[PDB]
Amino acid sequence: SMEGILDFSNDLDIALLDQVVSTFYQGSGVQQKQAQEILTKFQDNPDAWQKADQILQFSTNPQSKFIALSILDKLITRKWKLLPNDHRIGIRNFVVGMIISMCQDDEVFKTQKNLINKSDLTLVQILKQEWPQNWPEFIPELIGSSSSSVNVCENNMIVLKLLSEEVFDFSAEQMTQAKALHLKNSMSKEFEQIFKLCFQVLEQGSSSSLIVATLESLLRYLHWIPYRYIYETNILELLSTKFMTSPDTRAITLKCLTEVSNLKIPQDNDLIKRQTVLFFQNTLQQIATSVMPVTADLKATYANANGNDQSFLQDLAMFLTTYLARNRALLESDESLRELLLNAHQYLIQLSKIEERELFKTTLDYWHNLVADLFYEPLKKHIYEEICSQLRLVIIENMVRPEEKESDTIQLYKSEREVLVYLTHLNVIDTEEIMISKLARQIDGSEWSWHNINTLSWAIGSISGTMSEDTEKRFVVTVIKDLLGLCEQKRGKDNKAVVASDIMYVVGQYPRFLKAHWNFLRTVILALFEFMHETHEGVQDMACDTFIKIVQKCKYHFVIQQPRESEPFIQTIIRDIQKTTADLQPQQVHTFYKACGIIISEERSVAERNRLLSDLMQLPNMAWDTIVEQSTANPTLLLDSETVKIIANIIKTNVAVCTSMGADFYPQLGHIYYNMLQLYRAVSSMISAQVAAEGLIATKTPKVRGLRTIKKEILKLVETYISKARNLDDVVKVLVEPLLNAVLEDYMNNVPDARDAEVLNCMTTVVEKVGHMIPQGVILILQSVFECTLDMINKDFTEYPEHRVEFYKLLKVINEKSFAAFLELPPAAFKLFVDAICWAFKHNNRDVEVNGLQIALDLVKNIERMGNVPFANEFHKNYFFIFVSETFFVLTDSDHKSGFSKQALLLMKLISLVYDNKISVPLYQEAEVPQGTSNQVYLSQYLANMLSNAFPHLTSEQIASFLSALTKQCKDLVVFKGTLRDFLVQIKEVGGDPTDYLFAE
């Protein structure tokens, strides 16, 4: 029954409309859902705009009039110029009249703010179409009607605010460059009159709602108007005094003064400098006397969250930081301005104690600006000594967790570290004193807590490298000594676990100290080794992260023979490795072995390095040897989940060590390589035999997932070594041939759901590093993975996402390093290669789309480098316009805006080939064009026809002017892109001006 309004052969029943609307906004459940679908269909009727003048006159529902204006909005922005000129004047007239009559009825003006704002925006859309060329008296008449009524004057400030927004703040995306400039110049020409009205209202007016609406418009004006309207008038005085006292006007006025602090200003005039000082002086004065004194506890105020306090304190932080970052030098020399300078910063100190993550980051950014300047600028830091001393405490007490998963906490820690490092350089003594004092109150329990000891330990660790080695040594000693005593002072593994971790974090941050005190460094490591036996949650993971963290920095001191030692300490670590790691989880054992590989790589004697490597790998190599013996004996053992897990952990240990050692890992790799690939084959057979006997569901089972883990870690190990190898002859002559024989056929002949995407990733690295040396191997890779992978991913954009990504990474590196492989493809396979590139264009997936566009660009360059030869001539004849049209399609379909830049680059390269005569053969067929026609003429002809059928609502003149500008600008990417954007605007509407494409000229 509600679907009656969707029948236009009959008169629209307004009462039926108001019912559908009410059911949608106030209803619920099914009735709401039904009405919603009816309203959507009504609004999208291309004739629904004709019935808007009826709704706005005879409806009693504001939501219905709002929807009516939305229907008008679509019509004005997309099809205005298609109407008869009588409807344009009519629509204009009854939008103007509707606004006038809403402002005159004080009851409607008060209770229908949403519908009036919607009408003002609708009017603004008309202005963008019709003003000033077809409405030169709009601004003069607006200024006249403002004096006849406070309500109309207030509403005209809303109209001007919205106009300024649409012309200056949101025009870049929504208009052509020519149209944007036209309107910006039009508003600039008549602003002298607009400012006069605005300034008179502010100086004389008393209606607070009128004042606030005028200041909200001023906020938009300040984005673009010249500074003279601000400094050659009394408006700065008004903002910084009068309007800072009223809480109604205070919020907007403060935002206005923040923008004023960003105006383009000549930095050499002394009167202006005084004016900039003065409005800051007035503003701080009004805050101290009308809002709160500089001693006020803003942390407590913000937490109470009364009224708009939180917004005001946010806006004050933005104002103070913006002004001071630009102008604080104006306050630093004159002694009579010193109190103002420091009161402003004391407010920022108080603001910095607020518990609000994002506000703290705003003030922290300013503090960075300040302490960095005091670090380099002569004679400045003594001014801020008391500010800096308070800041040291604020930052130490609000220090956040370093990475030692939250990526918002990692960025903030590094920001805090930066400022605190600067603050330490500025006064090392004050920083040390605060930290020791803070540590004393951890020991007397007055401030003891898990949060407070962690925060202090992070702060202490963050300033590493700022003190002198002698002070650092005294400092580190006191801290560790005090922290160790704090550990005994506590009971319970929970307390002793917190303090233990903090102690190890601090020592891990001062490697300079550890490197100079061997006996200490040694004892530290031994404690970690004993902490690897403590089963308490977190200890073992801590012990291991600290060990490898210390090793990365102090590795040299583990590989040499230290005084009073009979062997390099690495040997002692390796001897007791089974005992040390006996209680660790697999992940933690691998980190340990990785840390040992870091040390071993410091030994540059090949013979001793390989011996250490052999000893480190003794345990996994003996387990390996044992399995390879019995695993081949009874291949069913690999169905034993215990053997599978053991194997996977042995391989993961080799991956860990290979990650640290890279090229030095080759000896160990050769020990397992040939038997590892045999294992890869045996595991493969079982996966295949399991899927044959159980179906595809077998791939989800723990048995098969464990078997595939083996294959994946084997590929990761080979990938890890090859990507770091320095001896590429051995890679090619020893590694590649057994590898390809082991993985390629297995990948090709498995069903889609059993193929490992890691094979593709592994091959990508092989091609990357030695691609130039195995042209036959690359060909073999394409034959085995290309067609069977493409058929997996060319039916939709969702299935096999990992294969999708790795597939185009592989084609990309093959196209870079061994383009000859594609020249060998049969014509039908090269056609699939082209199809696959364009298929990548159409992905929203960024991983795929970007590579697809790069492959296309690189392919064009590869072809071009071939010169005038048959293969290049045939490529252009077969695929030039396919790439041009496919590229144009994603440029204009509105679903691939993330790739605009690279689409534009590809299109500019394609167009420039024809206009530099880099294509030797005609791109047309003998028949369709006269003999001797230039490819330029045919290109513009093809594109003109292509765009005419794809965008039939464009005029032939538009298309012609767009292409003329586009081809003329194919050597200037920024201008090229601007012309494409202009085209993307014009295709959204009817009647685009073809001269807009002459903007660059």
Partner: peptide, 17 residues
């Protein structure tokens, strides 16, 4: 290195014993 630290840190391993 200060010799009293050693005494306190060598007992560090036995914190969980």
């Amino acid at each position: 290195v200060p010799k009293e630290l050693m005494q306190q840190i060598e007992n560090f391993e036995k914190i969980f014993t």
